User: Fold this.
Amino acid sequence: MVSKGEELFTGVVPILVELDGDVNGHKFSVSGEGEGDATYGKLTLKFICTTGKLPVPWPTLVTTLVQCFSRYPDHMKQHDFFKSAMPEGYVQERTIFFKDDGNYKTRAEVKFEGDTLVNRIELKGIDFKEDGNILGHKLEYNYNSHNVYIMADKQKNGIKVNFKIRHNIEDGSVQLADHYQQNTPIGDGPVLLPDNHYLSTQSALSKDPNEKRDHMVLLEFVTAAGITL
Amino acid sequence: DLGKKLLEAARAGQDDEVRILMANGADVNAADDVGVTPLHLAAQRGHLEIVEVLLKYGADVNAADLWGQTPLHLAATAGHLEIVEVLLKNGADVNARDNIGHTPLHLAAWAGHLEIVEVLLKYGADVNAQDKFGKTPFDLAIDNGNEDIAEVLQKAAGGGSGGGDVNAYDEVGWTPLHKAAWGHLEKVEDLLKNGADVNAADIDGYTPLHLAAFSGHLEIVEVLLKYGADVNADDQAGFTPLHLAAIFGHLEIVEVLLKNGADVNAQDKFGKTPFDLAIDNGNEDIAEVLQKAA
Assistant:
């Protein structure tokens, strides 16, 4: 039954995101702010590239830039690893393989800092093609819906997560980004290791007419499913 | 700090302070740096009296924040029935769309607010509006446990994916069988009785049998195979069902798959056989079965 950490998510929670990036030696920093409400699985966020022009397409950073805000239905509360690790938080690590191009490796800590849920990430990208879809900025400013698959990793006292992101390319084709993810608790308290299940995601990217810096406005809804009453 | 005090007065539910700030000429349509207005805040937080006085003074009922949300979206999400009613009576667009394409009716169905669903329908909500990912309000109610709302929507002629064709598929290529494979045996059985195609692959290449193996439902695995599921489906998935069963330690599923012709030599995209994956995942009991398989 319900974790103690779930109590921190009964209402709206402020969010901060900080990302340090280096892709093929192009350094950049992104900051985000907004809020999340796990009651509805809803994020309302805005991100800025504070260093100048972002050298990769914004869509490629969406999954790196807080799965504790997913809506878990009542019958699945005992399967919500993400909130159970709060407030001490979890480490989230990924490799993201862009088909026929380079990869991102990310390490993040997601935890409460005071009353704010904070996602702090280091991202390294290597082996990108200079005029590929990523470094050439050939991806549509859009996003798809996905199924995110979640499994327990008992040896690590955490979870493994796997999914494929589909990035629309300006010509009509699709760029696949294959995600391999692992999350482990930072603290020593009990956590919930789930039965296999999935998340269903929806996102929309937009722009703020009053923002002069390179930026991304993101609305996102995520719900957990796949375990029956 | 005049519009900021009003935004803060509206956020904090300070009826009198809102009342006072507005006699001093406070911009009822003040907006913060993400497009949130006093009316958004009052409607989201359930401040009926503040909603009413802001509308009195000319608050824009359909103002949209950066995420496309109007006050009606926020009130319909939160369950604030009286506020929903007053926004509609004062000209709110009942079919306004957030940046995902959700109408208020989507949001009320998604959040379980049945009385709000009814009043949105009364005011002309489009019962079969689709968000940008193809979901109707019925889909959102029924996939998220709000059966009472789903019935109200169906009585108002709302439909959803698979309501006419058991072989329809959604945005991610999920058919009704893909959704049911996650432990809804009776539903799987009914869909198969009614002609559902067991071999359909989703946008990632997964068949219902893949999903049932992943989630560990033996009796669903069995029935899908009884109805002609390809025991060795892979194609774009990168794994067969036997690989999945071996990773997750589902011994009885391994045995059923083997009895139905599963291929012990199938390699995943990393060159691994089911036996290799059983060893790699600490499932030596499955490895033992696999290397003796008939």
Remarks:
- The domain at 176-291 of chain B is CATH 1.25.40.20 (Serine Threonine Protein Phosphatase 5, Tetratricopeptide repeat).
- The radius of gyration of chain B is 26 Å.
- Residues 1 and 7 of chain B are 9 Å apart (CA to CA).
- Chain B is about 50% helix and 0% strand.
